[PDB]
Amino acid sequence: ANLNETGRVLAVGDGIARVFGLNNIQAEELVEFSSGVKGMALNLEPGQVGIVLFGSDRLVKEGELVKRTGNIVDVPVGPGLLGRVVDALGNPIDGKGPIDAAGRSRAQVKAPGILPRRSVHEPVQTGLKAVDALVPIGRGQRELIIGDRQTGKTAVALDTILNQKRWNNGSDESKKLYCVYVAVGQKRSTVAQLVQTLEQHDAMKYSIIVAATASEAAPLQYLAPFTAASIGEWFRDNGKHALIVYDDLSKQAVAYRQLSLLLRRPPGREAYPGDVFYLHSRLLERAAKLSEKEGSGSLTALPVIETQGGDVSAYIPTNVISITDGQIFLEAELFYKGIRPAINVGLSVSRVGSAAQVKALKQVAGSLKLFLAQYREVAASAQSDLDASTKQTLVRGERLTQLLKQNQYSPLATEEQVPLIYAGVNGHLDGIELSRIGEFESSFLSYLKSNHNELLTEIREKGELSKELLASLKSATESFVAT
Amino acid sequence: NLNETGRVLAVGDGIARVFGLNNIQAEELVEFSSGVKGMALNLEPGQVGIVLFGSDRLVKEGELVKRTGNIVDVPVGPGLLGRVVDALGNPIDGKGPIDAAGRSRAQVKAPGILPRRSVHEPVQTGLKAVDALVPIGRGQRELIIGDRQTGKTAVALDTILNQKRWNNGSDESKKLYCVYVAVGQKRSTVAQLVQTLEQHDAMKYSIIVAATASEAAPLQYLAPFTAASIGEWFRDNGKHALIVYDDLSKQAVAYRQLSLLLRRPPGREAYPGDVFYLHSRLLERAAKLSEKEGSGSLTALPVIETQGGDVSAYIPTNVISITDGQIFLEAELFYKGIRPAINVGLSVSRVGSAAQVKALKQVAGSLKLFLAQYREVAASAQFGSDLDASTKQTLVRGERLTQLLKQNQYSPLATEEQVPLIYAGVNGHLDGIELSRIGEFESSFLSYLKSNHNELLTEIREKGELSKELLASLKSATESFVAT
Amino acid sequence: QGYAAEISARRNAMDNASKNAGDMINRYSILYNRTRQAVITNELVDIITGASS
Amino acid sequence: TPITGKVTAVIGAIVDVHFEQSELPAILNALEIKTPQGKLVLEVAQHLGENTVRTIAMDGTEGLVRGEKVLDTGGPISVPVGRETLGRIINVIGEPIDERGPIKSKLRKPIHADPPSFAEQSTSAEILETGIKVVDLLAPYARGGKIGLFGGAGVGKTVFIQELINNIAKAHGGFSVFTGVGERTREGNDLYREMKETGVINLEGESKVALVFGQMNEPPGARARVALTGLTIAEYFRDEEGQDVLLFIDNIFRFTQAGSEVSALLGRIPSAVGYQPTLATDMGLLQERITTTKKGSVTSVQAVYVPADDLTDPAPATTFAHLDATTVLSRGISELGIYPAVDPLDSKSRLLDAAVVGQEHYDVASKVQETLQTYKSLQDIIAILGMDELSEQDKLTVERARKIQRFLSQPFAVAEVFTGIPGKLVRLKDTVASFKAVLEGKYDNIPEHAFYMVGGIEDVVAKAEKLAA
Numbered sequence A: 001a002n003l004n005e006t007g008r009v010l011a012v013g014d015g016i017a018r019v020f021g022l023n024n025i026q027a028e029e030l031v032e033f034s035s036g037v038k039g040m041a042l043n044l045e046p047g048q049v050g051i052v053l054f055g056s057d058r059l060v061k062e063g064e065l066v067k068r069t070g071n072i073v074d075v076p077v078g079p080g081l082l083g084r085v086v087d088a089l090g091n092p093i094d095g096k097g098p099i100d101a102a103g104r105s106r107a108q109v110k111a112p113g114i115l116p117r118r119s120v121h122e123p124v125q126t127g128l129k130a131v132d133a134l135v136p137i138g139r140g141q142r143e144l145i146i147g148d149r150q151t152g153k154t155a156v157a158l159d160t161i162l163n164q165k166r167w168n169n170g171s172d173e174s175k176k177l178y179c180v181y182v183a184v185g186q187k188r189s190t191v192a193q194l195v196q197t198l199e200q201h202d203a204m205k206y207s208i209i210v211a212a213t214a215s216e217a218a219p220l221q222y223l224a225p226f227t228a229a230s231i232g233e234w235f236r237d238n239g240k241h242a243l244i245v246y247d248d249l250s251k252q253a254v255a256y257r258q259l260s261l262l263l264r265r266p267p268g269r270e271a272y273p274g275d276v277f278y279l280h281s282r283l284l285e286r287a288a289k290l291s292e293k294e295g296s297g298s299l300t301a302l303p304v305i306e307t308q309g310g311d312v313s314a315y316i317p318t319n320v321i322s323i324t325d326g327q328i329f330l331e332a333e334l335f336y337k338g339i340r341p342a343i344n345v346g347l348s349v350s351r352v353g354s355a356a357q358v359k360a361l362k363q364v365a366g367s368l369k370l371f372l373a374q375y376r377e378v379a380a381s382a383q384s385d386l387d388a389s390t391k392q393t394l395v396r397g398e399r400l401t402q403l404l405k406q407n408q409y410s411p412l413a414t415e416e417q418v419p420l421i422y423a424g425v426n427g428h429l430d431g432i433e434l435s436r437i438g439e440f441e442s443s444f445l446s447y448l449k450s451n452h453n454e455l456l457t458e459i460r461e462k463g464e465l466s467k468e469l470l471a472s473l474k475s476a477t478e479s480f481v482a483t
Numbered sequence B: 001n002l003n004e005t006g007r008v009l010a011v012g013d014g015i016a017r018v019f020g021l022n023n024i025q026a027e028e029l030v031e032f033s034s035g036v037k038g039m040a041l042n043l044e045p046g047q048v049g050i051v052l053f054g055s056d057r058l059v060k061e062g063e064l065v066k067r068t069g070n071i072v073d074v075p076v077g078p079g080l081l082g083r084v085v086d087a088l089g090n091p092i093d094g095k096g097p098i099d100a101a102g103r104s105r106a107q108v109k110a111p112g113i114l115p116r117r118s119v120h121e122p123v124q125t126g127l128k129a130v131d132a133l134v135p136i137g138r139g140q141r142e143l144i145i146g147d148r149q150t151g152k153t154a155v156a157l158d159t160i161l162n163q164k165r166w167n168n169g170s171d172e173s174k175k176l177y178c179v180y181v182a183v184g185q186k187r188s189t190v191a192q193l194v195q196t197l198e199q200h201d202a203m204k205y206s207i208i209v210a211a212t213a214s215e216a217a218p219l220q221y222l223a224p225f226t227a228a229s230i231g232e233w234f235r236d237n238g239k240h241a242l243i244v245y246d247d248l249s250k251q252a253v254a255y256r257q258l259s260l261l262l263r264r265p266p267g268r269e270a271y272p273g274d275v276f277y278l279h280s281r282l283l284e285r286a287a288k289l290s291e292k293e294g295s296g297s298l299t300a301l302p303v304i305e306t307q308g309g310d311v312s313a314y315i316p317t318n319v320i321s322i323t324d325g326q327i328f329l330e331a332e333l334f335y336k337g338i339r340p341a342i343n344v345g346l347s348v349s350r351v352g353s354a355a356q357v358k359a360l361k362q363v364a365g366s367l368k369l370f371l372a373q374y375r376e377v378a379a380s381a382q383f384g385s386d387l388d389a390s391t392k393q394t395l396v397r398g399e400r401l402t403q404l405l406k407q408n409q410y411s412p413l414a415t416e417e418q419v420p421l422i423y424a425g426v427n428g429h430l431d432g433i434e435l436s437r438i439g440e441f442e443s444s445f446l447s448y449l450k451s452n453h454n455e456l457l458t459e460i461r462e463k464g465e466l467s468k469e470l471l472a473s474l475k476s477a478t479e480s481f482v483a484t
Numbered sequence C: 001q002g003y004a005a006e007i008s009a010r011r012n013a014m015d016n017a018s019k020n021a022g023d024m025i026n027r028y029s030i031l032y033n034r035t036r037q038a039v040i041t042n043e044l045v046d047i048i049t050g051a052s053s
Numbered sequence D: 001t002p003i004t005g006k007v008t009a010v011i012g013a014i015v016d017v018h019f020e021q022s023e024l025p026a027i028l029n030a031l032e033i034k035t036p037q038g039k040l041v042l043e044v045a046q047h048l049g050e051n052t053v054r055t056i057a058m059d060g061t062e063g064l065v066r067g068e069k070v071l072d073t074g075g076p077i078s079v080p081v082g083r084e085t086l087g088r089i090i091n092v093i094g095e096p097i098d099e100r101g102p103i104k105s106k107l108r109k110p111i112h113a114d115p116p117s118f119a120e121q122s123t124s125a126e127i128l129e130t131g132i133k134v135v136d137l138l139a140p141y142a143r144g145g146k147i148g149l150f151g152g153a154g155v156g157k158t159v160f161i162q163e164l165i166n167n168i169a170k171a172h173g174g175f176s177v178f179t180g181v182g183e184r185t186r187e188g189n190d191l192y193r194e195m196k197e198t199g200v201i202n203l204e205g206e207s208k209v210a211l212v213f214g215q216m217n218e219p220p221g222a223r224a225r226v227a228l229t230g231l232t233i234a235e236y237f238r239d240e241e242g243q244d245v246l247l248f249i250d251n252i253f254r255f256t257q258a259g260s261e262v263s264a265l266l267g268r269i270p271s272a273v274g275y276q277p278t279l280a281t282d283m284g285l286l287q288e289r290i291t292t293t294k295k296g297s298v299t300s301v302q303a304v305y306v307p308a309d310d311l312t313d314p315a316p317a318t319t320f321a322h323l324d325a326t327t328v329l330s331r332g333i334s335e336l337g338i339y340p341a342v343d344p345l346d347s348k349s350r351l352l353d354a355a356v357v358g359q360e361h362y363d364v365a366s367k368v369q370e371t372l373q374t375y376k377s378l379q380d381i382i383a384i385l386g387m388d389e390l391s392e393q394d395k396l397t398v399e400r401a402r403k404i405q406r407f408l409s410q411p412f413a414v415a416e417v418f419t420g421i422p423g424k425l426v427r428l429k430d431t432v433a434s435f436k437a438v439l440e441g442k443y444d445n446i447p448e449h450a451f452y453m454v455g456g457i458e459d460v461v462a463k464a465e466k467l468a469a
């Protein structure tokens, strides 16, 4: 037995195997145990190596042989993973056979530096009225989806993926956006069901699923987002665009905490290791928009965080907020009232997306940012005087609040969006009741499609509002409202 | 021959584990061949753990460590006045050698039970609020405590500056030599403080001991104890010294760093188990010596920093239990325009009135209890009350009494200036005056009494007491001024 | 009339207050709970550091 | 003929190296491992005994092998110092990262240097006019001072610095050094595009600011040290060039955080909250070098992250005493749409003193502060029971405080996207007078909204009439 290429197990417990030999091993090299279970050389010491396991401890005994692999932790990458569901190490879990890899990338890849980047200016269209109008996301950005349990976090990301069906059926490769969805810590059934939804809406052919679910070993959960970013990165490095959802990072952090405490690293705040920030920061730095010279690709990140009791000041929330380029905060209070998406506009922001917004939306979003989250000034005070001036903003406010509502699985085209907002901002809804704003919107879009389709087409094709189209839009709006 | 020398076994983080040094004493000074000096704090079977008094960048495995044969000591003596030194008494003002009467160890047994006498001589701080409500005696430990940037140093600083009234004389019994201990402050902050003492000509009777923020934890830990010794000389020779520890919170942090790196198992909040002892032995050394011992004293104003108003925190709770009372400074009072931002309710001087020039004691009757009765009422006024004649008046009186306790920094006052103010206040010669004008009253009035009724002020300074004759003169004199 | 106006205004202002109070009680029951958890963890870490040496 | 050892142990950022000879590299020396791509740099941290040293790597340690050859450089990490650094982008190890060739500097200085002695200190009380209302009014910045911006995540630290660079950088005469520690690589891109576009860095021409980066993608070793690199350059300007130097750091907390990431791996017992026992002295050794001395002047702005919005966390709390001026940003405040989100009752200045700013300035600042304070002491009662249950005095103070509150807000030029409004700037003398008048009850009839996001008092008058039409 070569002790250079090979090892003998000294001990195993707490997700670590202590191994003797493997003298030629590299730090962070993947290893193989007798049972076929894999590991990662984490700490090389005089006279032994400490290996973190990617499975149950049952699958490793004392005295067993361990084989070197040659390879730092890596994964298959390339357009051949499209339509596929894999585990954190890249192994298919969808019943469909060997993955078709263009090649292999490390799990841990260094972020694009200061030079190879350019500011985001290309829209990521979500098809969500509230997000596209008020927290516009640009290709290369990082935008946190954050909020309590059961507040629509996943819905927001999933509508975004379903929405890409719009361009991923065209030919123009630059407008396309491939999707990597990472499930970390979720239930197997949630993810199975999610994939079936994707299949049913025909979204699956442009998306990749990477799953490390609830009963799997902490390191597989720790690892999944990293192997998913290299999968995402392939598109970035080859002049194409990929969206990556990390659902969710809260659970990644928890798994990382499990590993650190069993590794006997000192518990800090909320028991997380000191490096739990570096955990996320290195991951998320890999999202970017690249320069002309680097082929202009982009990886856009939508990490998901789960607050407890709505507290965005906890350690992990604030860590991620101090990394991403903004947050979409979802309030449980709005969610229970029926306001869904429950986007708390006061607390939501996109730091770089404004540039990348579609002009049409930008133009009918005049101050909507300021006004709405400020109607919130009056609204909170309202329930001391039956005022004159501030009775108007209470009626407009209430309207735009309904306009922003949106059914699930129903992402809407920009040119379907801008009229609804124009019709809100200019007060053509002021007269219509609350209970009918829902029906108004479906009936109004029908009207526009059948009768004023020339104009929608112009919004879609130029993305701007010429004074003439602006005036023509005023025309068609007034007509419908009157009846 | 490993009895006087040793070899560095391992080194880092300002800590060295040394082989040999077989005859070394616990707490002994050592010299590493590369120049740096150290202190043996761990003596174990096969080795010695030493904390470095400087950088360890130059220490190497195998390097030779030498016994000094000395327990950490310092130069002490009158020669040190006007100077700024580090923890080991090395001069850091570039003014050359110190001349010392001798050397005392850093750690010194405190006065026992027999060799002491009750505090009875005031430390006149010059601040109305303190001197009236929390008077400090010669040999008392009075804690200064509060959150960051609340006035803590400005309380101690106005005391040092005030000692000028007596330090410029020859009368040695009345003089109060000052010692200021900067621990973990930034050098610039200290330069700014010795710049101010200079401008007030207070540096000539002060000694600065600075273990500032970039210096090795063993230097910060040591600074208070070696600074007690510098101060003890005054105490041990019929003189008097005030000692300001600015601040002990930062020294406790340094001791913690020391102990964890020595791999001594920590206690609460990672502090060493004996962190209470760390502070108690320091402050027990402040003391008022008995006549058979020359009658000298050491008064200590230790400074603690609380976080978020948290006085129940470990270290602040420790020190509170050691001292003879505290001055609680509060950010909320600071911003209402109360300076010094002293919480009167929470602040005591335990030695109390036994350490207060008699005149001030008389005119400040139940000022402290009254001010409590005032806030008892400023509480009932909240829910939109309407008060009877007594309550609305005392509410007016206290609101003005509070106003009279405001005071500018670097504007300390003499008891004979303090007394008339407190006198006018408590009696009610200020009630029928518009509130916003008590400030200009204070200076107009003290000028008035300096030109017209000056013989009075002269009397109080000399005789430190009042009789019916002094009372009625002043009562007649104040009543005069009220009509502008 | 002034009395019945006052009595109606009391029951009305107090309704808004008790509502507004409960809201703060809700916001502080949450902070309470955070702090309580933090207290148990932080205490445990000292026991842990102490045990390791 | 060099000094070589072999790698004995690898745990994360920490690499242990054995040497075969009696002679062993000094603590703080830079070592080298030749790899497939480039060179990995390690910094000696401690001597473990038995001829083995412990080091902290400056880049990832993936791929290292026990037995791998280690080279001693016989010196610490060194950086290009001098004018040749201006308009370049540099590493923690002093290599360029803007692909513009070698920094052809005449000298290279070690990044570890001893702080300037007590004797070398040079104190002043000289106001630095910012054109930002709250700062200029309530807590003035000091020329050659140490200014620090404290904020939770997203509350506005970086926008603030960019406004200050926008105000002070072009008209300073001297040279700036910006150091990015543990921040967004993209933010570096946003700024290198910025200093180019404004001309403060000119590709062909001449440049006033050197940039040094060690962002949040970087392993801990690099995050720890990158501030000492950006400082060593700042010190060369201060000393030999007798330059009045501006130093910006975003973000200084990241330095200390990087220290805790490795502390465990170095064998230390954790202090409070899991931080390194040396948190304070590590910070003293860094802070104290960032000072104005007798040879020259350094005005320094530091972004200071506040973990979990907890200003009592050892890191930010230990930072306070190092600063001559502190601006504390509040989430609660920023959530009222008040930008800058400066807490006017928790930001402080050495220079807030009548003997510096004049009694009129002092008196206004303080009455403003008393006013705001009254509102604070009342908030609970205002929120539970409303305005009705205040005495008239109070009702008026509350009415006024809220006008001051909003008047302290100001449209920055660099937040034009989020304000929708052009960036206004207010001369100190105008801030003083404008506020003075509000207190004097001169603007009570004006609705609250007219003070929100404007410049000076002329601008209120304007917006009040704009609303009344």
Ligand SMILES: Nc1ncnc2c1ncn2[C@@H]1O[C@H](COP(=O)(O)OP(=O)(O)NP(=O)(O)O)[C@@H](O)[C@H]1O
Pocket (backbone or CB within 6 Å): A148, A149, A150, A151, A152, A153, A154, A155, A156, A340, A341, A406, A407, A408
């Ligand atoms: N826009 C919407 N309109 C109506 N219902 C919705 C909308 N979005 C989500 N829902 C429903 O609300 C529930 C919560 O949404 P989901 O996207 O699962 O949030 P989540 O924050 O990911 N919950 P979890 O991850 O399980 O804690 C789901 O049952 C959705 O079907």
Ligand SMILES: Nc1ncnc2c1ncn2[C@@H]1O[C@H](COP(=O)(O)OP(=O)(O)NP(=O)(O)O)[C@@H](O)[C@H]1O
Pocket (backbone or CB within 6 Å): B147, B148, B149, B150, B151, B152, B153, B154, B155, B339, B340, B407, B408, B409, D321, D349, D350
């Ligand atoms: N009586 C006073 N009136 C007005 N201002 C004062 C007064 N006393 C102190 N100040 C100022 O308030 C600030 C804080 O005072 P300082 O004495 O440094 O308190 P501290 O709590 O030791 N601060 P720090 O060491 O920074 O935590 C300083 O700028 C003083 O100049």
Ligand SMILES: Nc1ncnc2c1ncn2[C@@H]1O[C@H](COP(=O)(O)OP(=O)(O)NP(=O)(O)O)[C@@H](O)[C@H]1O
Pocket (backbone or CB within 6 Å): A321, A322, A323, A349, A350, A351, D151, D152, D153, D154, D155, D156, D157, D158, D159, D160, D339, D340, D412, D415, D418, D419
């Ligand atoms: N002066 C301002 N005016 C208007 N909005 C602002 C201002 N400053 C910050 N914001 C808002 O808050 C965001 C915070 O940006 P930034 O200045 O990077 O804060 P920060 O505290 O450094 N964030 P981080 O470092 O990630 O914790 C901005 O993108 C704006 O949306």
Ligand SMILES: [Mg+2]
Pocket (backbone or CB within 6 Å): A153, A154, A155, A247
């Ligand atoms: Mg979900």
Ligand SMILES: [Mg+2]
Pocket (backbone or CB within 6 Å): B152, B153, B154
């Ligand atoms: Mg102080």
Ligand SMILES: [Mg+2]
Pocket (backbone or CB within 6 Å): D157, D158, D183, D250, D303
């Ligand atoms: Mg920032």
